[PDB]
Amino acid sequence: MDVFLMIRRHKTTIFTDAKESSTVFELKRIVEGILKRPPDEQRLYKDDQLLDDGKTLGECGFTSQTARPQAPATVGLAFRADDTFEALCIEPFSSP
Amino acid sequence: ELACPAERSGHVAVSDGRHMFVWGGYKSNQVRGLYDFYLPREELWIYNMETGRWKKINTEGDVPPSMSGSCAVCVDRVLYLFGGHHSRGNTNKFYMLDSRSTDRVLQWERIDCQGIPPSSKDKLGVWVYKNKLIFFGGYGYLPEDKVLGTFEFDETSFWNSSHPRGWNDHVHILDTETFTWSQPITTGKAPSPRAAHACATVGNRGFVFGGRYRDARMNDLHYLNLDTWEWNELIPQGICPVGRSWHSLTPVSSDHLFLFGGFTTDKQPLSDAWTYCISKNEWIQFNHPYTEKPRLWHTACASDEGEVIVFGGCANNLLVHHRAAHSNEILIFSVQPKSLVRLSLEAVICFKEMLANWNCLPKHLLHSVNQRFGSNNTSGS
Amino acid sequence: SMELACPAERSGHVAVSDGRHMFVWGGYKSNQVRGLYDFYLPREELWIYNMETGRWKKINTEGDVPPSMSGSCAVCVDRVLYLFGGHHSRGNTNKFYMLDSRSTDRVLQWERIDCQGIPPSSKDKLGVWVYKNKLIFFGGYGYLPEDKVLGTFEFDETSFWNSSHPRGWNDHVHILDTETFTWSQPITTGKAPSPRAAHACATVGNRGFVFGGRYRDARMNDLHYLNLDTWEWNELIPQGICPVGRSWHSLTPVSSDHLFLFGGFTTDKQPLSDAWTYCISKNEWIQFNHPYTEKPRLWHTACASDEGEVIVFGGCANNLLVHHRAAHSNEILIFSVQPKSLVRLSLEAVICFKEMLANSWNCLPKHLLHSVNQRFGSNNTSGS
Amino acid sequence: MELACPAERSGHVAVSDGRHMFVWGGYKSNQVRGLYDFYLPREELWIYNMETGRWKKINTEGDVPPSMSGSCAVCVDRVLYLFGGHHSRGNTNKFYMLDSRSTDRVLQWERIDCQGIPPSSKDKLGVWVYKNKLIFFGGYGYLPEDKVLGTFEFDETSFWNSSHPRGWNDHVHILDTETFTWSQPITTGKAPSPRAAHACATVGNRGFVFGGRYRDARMNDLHYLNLDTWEWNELIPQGICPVGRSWHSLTPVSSDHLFLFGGFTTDKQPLSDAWTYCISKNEWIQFNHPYTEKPRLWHTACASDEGEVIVFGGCANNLLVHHRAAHSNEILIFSVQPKSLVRLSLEAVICFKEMLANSWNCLPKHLLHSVNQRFGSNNTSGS
Amino acid sequence: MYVKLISSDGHEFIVKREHALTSGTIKAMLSGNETNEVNFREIPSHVLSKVCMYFTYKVRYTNSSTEIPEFPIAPEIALELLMAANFLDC
Question: Which one-letter DSSP state was computed for residue D95?
Answer without folding.
Answer: E
